[PDB]
Design a protein around this ligand. Structure first.
Ligand SMILES: [Mg+2]
Ligand SMILES: [Mg+2]
Ligand SMILES: [Mg+2]
Ligand SMILES: [Mg+2]
Ligand SMILES: [Mg+2]
Ligand SMILES: [Mg+2]
Ligand SMILES: [Mg+2]
Ligand SMILES: [Mg+2]
Ligand SMILES: [Mg+2]
Ligand SMILES: [Mg+2]
Ligand SMILES: [Mg+2]
Ligand SMILES: [Mg+2]
Ligand SMILES: [Mg+2]
Ligand SMILES: [Mg+2]
Ligand SMILES: [Mg+2]
Ligand SMILES: [Mg+2]
Ligand SMILES: [Mg+2]
Ligand SMILES: [Mg+2]
Ligand SMILES: [Mg+2]
Ligand SMILES: [Mg+2]
Ligand SMILES: [Mg+2]
Ligand SMILES: [Mg+2]
Ligand SMILES: [Mg+2]
Ligand SMILES: [Mg+2]
Ligand SMILES: [Mg+2]
Ligand SMILES: [Mg+2]
Ligand SMILES: [Mg+2]
Ligand SMILES: [Mg+2]
Ligand SMILES: [Mg+2]
Ligand SMILES: [Mg+2]
Ligand SMILES: [Mg+2]
Ligand SMILES: [Mg+2]
Ligand SMILES: [Mg+2]
Ligand SMILES: [Mg+2]
Lengths: 64, 53, 204, 111
RNA sequence: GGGUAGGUGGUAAGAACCUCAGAUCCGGAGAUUUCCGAAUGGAGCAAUCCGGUAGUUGGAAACAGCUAUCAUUAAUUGAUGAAUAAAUAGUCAAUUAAAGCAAUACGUGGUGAAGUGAAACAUCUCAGUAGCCACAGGAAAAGAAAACGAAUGUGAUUCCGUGUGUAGUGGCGAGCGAAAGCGGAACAGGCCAAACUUAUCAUUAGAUAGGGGUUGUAGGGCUUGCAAUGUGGACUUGAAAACGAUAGAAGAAGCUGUUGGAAAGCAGCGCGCAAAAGGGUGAUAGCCCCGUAUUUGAAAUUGUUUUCAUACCUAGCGAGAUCCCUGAGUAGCUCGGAAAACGUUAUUUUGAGUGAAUCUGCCCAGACCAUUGGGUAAGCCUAAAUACUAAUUAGUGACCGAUAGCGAAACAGUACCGUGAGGGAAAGGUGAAAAGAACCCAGAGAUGGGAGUGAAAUAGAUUCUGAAACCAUAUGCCUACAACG
RNA sequence: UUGUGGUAGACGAGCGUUGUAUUGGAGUUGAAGUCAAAGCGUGAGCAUUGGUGGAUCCAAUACAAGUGAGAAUGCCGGCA
RNA sequence: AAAUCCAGGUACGGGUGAAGACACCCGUUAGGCGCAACGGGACGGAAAGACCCCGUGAAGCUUUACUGUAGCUUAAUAUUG
């Protein structure tokens, strides 16, 4: 599914309000961008993660 | 009409579908005027005046 | 929803946030939890009332009461004549199982209560199953014969041990009293009267 | 135990037959009836059927048999007493054999 | 174990047996449990087909019997091992769990309309309802203040009444509608991270396993003393006792006469009651029977509570130092949405982006600032009151009484309809007892008329009572020159 | 004394069905049901007798309603 | 068997009438009841008119009617040196 692999945070369903307040259901998708990290002997394994998690990995020295 | 819930009296008058025994806080208008006859205890009567106030 | 592999993600980070929140190290604390909660008390600085609360707890435990029942009994005794500091003591000590424990046919007050609930207990103008009836100073409590048919008997001995505010003859199973317990027979475990004022604030 | 058993003398206390003494030959507990010899004589109109070795003859005319009677209408008959009378029974247990035994309540006669 | 003298399940008679060395029957505990079905050795058109492996018995072998085992995924462990040295991917083996179903009912979460109303309609309502899906549990959810809110105030959550159809919110239209406070049901608060310290990891630890700690009238750690050996739990194992649940035992009291087929009705004279609830017995029985009130009883399984011991947690008040720790892609902010009564806004939440501080700190008191005051976010667990009844036991009905009551009183989700999903009926009563009509006559027979049983046969299996419409027969009157609601 | 035609409609007074609560009463010497007849009422309605029928029913005062059928190309069953 | 059927014992002429009568008014004619025929009438039967109108009805279709939207395209921003 279109979801992160580190966390379980997925899409967010909501309303598409326009002028005249017409209601149409829409979906916000998370920015799943590929990322490589070093775990278990630094073994890089591409993992589709959200940019938010990408920032977290970068600050946590993990992303190297 | 009984104030102290005697047990010997309650053991009897239970196989008699006709007669019945009740406490002062249990009798109502209908039970009173269905009686056509009633035997009232003296201390029940003293409590009666107290309840009326 | 796939091969979540908690090892894969947990080790993937080794600290992170989700990792540490879940950190399997998660012990049991399954004895820490119970006991400390159990029941506490002490007195503080800002409210004073701390003493009242602790004393209330002690008194309720001495007789095995729920706070709601206590509020009911205080409401009952509150209205009458005046400085009723002699009435509520009799009210708190008029419990049937309380009388059964001071009567001496049970090892402990709650055990006596269990007996009462199990239908051991015979009264005068009535009988008894509920362990909460308020008894009158001069009332009899003839013990059953079935209980004696189960000789554990060890009890009868306690009966004589007694406390002066209870007059019960051993083996013969009978009891009544007069001169309701004075404060001497209500020992210093709980002997104060500002718990009364605590309930006056909390209960109208 | 049971009020009526197979064998003891019994009489009828209600119906067309009054004071009919007899011996119970069989008891159906489920429908609560009792076959007593000499009482409730019914006469089935015996037809003729021939489909078996015994049915080849099956000689049956006006055979009179026994009709079942409700156990409520039955009452035990006393024998030990010099003056026999109809009464009700108890279920005393004598410690001599520790076995339940029927005893009448208007006398002291066993069974 | 209880309990007896009958039993071999119903339409069901007969034949043949069993049973007093204690049968059938009731209760507790076990044994066996074909095939399909989550189905799981492989397949497949369900109740079928085709096997592998390791044993063991016959055969001279193929083979055939008799056993056990053989699915997938996830976790742990071990062995083996690519591109490519090492190492992984991968492969194999062992152990432990998961699959599914149902209670036409309750819970949580995700998703989520339309008919309709607004007398049209798009904002709005309907409605976060129906439906779809995921996960449970015996309840679930929630939960211990970065809170309410305006005070010399209350002090987890949940549920009920009121506050009130109030403040408010609404093409300010249709409509929607709290949060405080007050009265009640129940009541319980707990535990980690970090400091500091111990031991070990090529100790590059930034990791593992322990001691220490759990906060707001700030708490804890650092150093230094006094008082403590207790009280209490949401608590483990045992032992004992009590109250029950799953079969049961005992359990009082009536005769006579009359109508009647039959008495229990009616009448006379009695009797018992902690039993006058009910059912049956040829009509309407307190005393005919079974029962009921009441007193009792468990070998075995199981529930609740209590007692004792036993593990495991749990403890106060000071002094000094002025040092350290208190949860970060977090709280805020911007851009689009939403939750709350609110149609987006102080508070809560988040898809994208950015991004702080560290008790003289941070958040809140409906924009915002200052003063005052309240509270300690970014970690976890939490009984009780609360929601519901497919099922087990007891019971009740100014509830229904075969067109009613569940669709289904009978063998009803059946017959039947449709490829299928699906749709879906009608139908009860002889008599106290079959004593269910032997026999005679007519007829080919069914059947009918007698006979017989029965109180009744015009109660006869067409089987309680038998209405009208409808069809025939007949006593009496009228009617074939007569225009007719 | 003045009145009494009447649809929509307003108001008032009553009848009838079933059950419940209190009183009393009838019933295998025959209740309900059901059919017939030459009765009584201002109206809904109410009796008497006889046949059939085989076990419940009636009167008074109150109470509660699935309480009143001629029509809906009404539903079901039967019969023209 | 079938649709049909308010109960019928169901004439004609002129007139009348909700405006075209088996049934009303005034006259005329006609014994009771069938059978075989043919269709004049019973505004005959079957189908709650499809034409027309009405309803602040439904549905399908169309467009520079309104309000939106899938898709396509452009820019900012993150991945992004
Ligand atoms: Mg909408
Ligand atoms: Mg046995
Ligand atoms: Mg709409
Ligand atoms: Mg509308
Ligand atoms: Mg409308
Ligand atoms: Mg929970
Ligand atoms: Mg018992
Ligand atoms: Mg018995
Ligand atoms: Mg008896
Ligand atoms: Mg009876
Ligand atoms: Mg804020
Ligand atoms: Mg909303
Ligand atoms: Mg502060
Ligand atoms: Mg904090
Ligand atoms: Mg039905
Ligand atoms: Mg019917
Ligand atoms: Mg079929
Ligand atoms: Mg005949
Ligand atoms: Mg017939
Ligand atoms: Mg009939
Ligand atoms: Mg003539
Ligand atoms: Mg003529
Ligand atoms: Mg004429
Ligand atoms: Mg008038
Ligand atoms: Mg009536
Ligand atoms: Mg009659
Ligand atoms: Mg009706
Ligand atoms: Mg026909
Ligand atoms: Mg004209
Ligand atoms: Mg036509
Ligand atoms: Mg029309
Ligand atoms: Mg329109
Ligand atoms: Mg419309
Ligand atoms: Mg682009």
């Amino acid at each position: 599914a279109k979801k992160d692999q580190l966390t379980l945070r997925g899409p967010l369903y909501g309303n598409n309000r326009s002028h005249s307040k017409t209601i149409t259901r829409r979906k916000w998708n998370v920015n799943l961008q590929p990322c490589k990290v070093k775990t278990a002997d630094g073994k890089t394994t591409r993992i589709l993660v959200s940019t938010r998690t990408l920032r977290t990995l970068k600050k946590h020295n993990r992303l190297s | 009409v009984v104030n102290t819930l005697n047990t010997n009296l309650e053991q009897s008058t239970s196989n008699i579908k006709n007669v019945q025994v009740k406490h002062l806080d249990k009798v109502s208008v209908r039970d009173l005027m269905l009686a056509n006859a009633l035997l009232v205890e003296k201390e029940v009567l003293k409590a009666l005046e107290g309840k009326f106030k | 929803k796939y091969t979540g592999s908690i090892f894969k993600r947990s080790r993937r980070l080794g600290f992170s946030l989700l990792e540490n929140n879940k950190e399997f190290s998660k012990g049991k604390k399954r004895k820490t939890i119970p006991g400390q909660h159990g029941n506490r008390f002490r007195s503080s600085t800002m409210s004073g009332y701390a003493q009242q609360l602790q004393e209330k707890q002690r008194m309720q435990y001495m007789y095995g009461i729920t706070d709601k029942q206590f509020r009911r009994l205080f409401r009952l005794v509150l209205k009458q004549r005046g400085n009723l500091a002699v009435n509520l003591f009799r009210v708190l000590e008029s419990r049937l199982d309380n009388i059964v424990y001071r009567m001496g046919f049970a090892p402990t007050r709650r055990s006596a209560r269990q007996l009462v609930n199990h239908g051991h207990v015979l009264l005068n103008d009535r009988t008894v199953d509920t362990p909460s009836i308020i008894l009158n100073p001069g009332d009899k409590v003839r013990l059953k014969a079935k209980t004696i048919k189960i000789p554990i008997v060890k009890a009868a001995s306690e009966s004589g041990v007694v406390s002066p505010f209870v007059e019960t003859n051993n083996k013969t199973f009978e009891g009544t009293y007069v001169r309701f317990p004075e404060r001497s027979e209500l020992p210093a475990g709980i002997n104060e009267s500002y718990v009364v004022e605590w309930y006056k604030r909390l209960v109208k | 135990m049971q009020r009526i058993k197979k064998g003891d003398k019994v009489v009828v206390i209600t119906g067309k037959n009054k004071g009919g003494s007899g011996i119970v030959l069989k008891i159906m507990p489920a429908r609560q009836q009792a076959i007593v010899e000499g009482l409730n004589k019914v006469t089935r109109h015996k037809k003729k059927d021939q489909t078996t070795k015994r049915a080849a003859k099956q000689s049956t005319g006006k055979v009179q048999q026994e009709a079942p009677i409700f156990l409520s209408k039955l009452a035990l008959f006393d024998q030990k007493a010099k003056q026999q009378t109809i009464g009700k029974i108890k279920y005393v247990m004598d410690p001599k054999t520790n076995k339940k035994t029927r005893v009448f309540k208007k006398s002291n006669n066993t069974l």
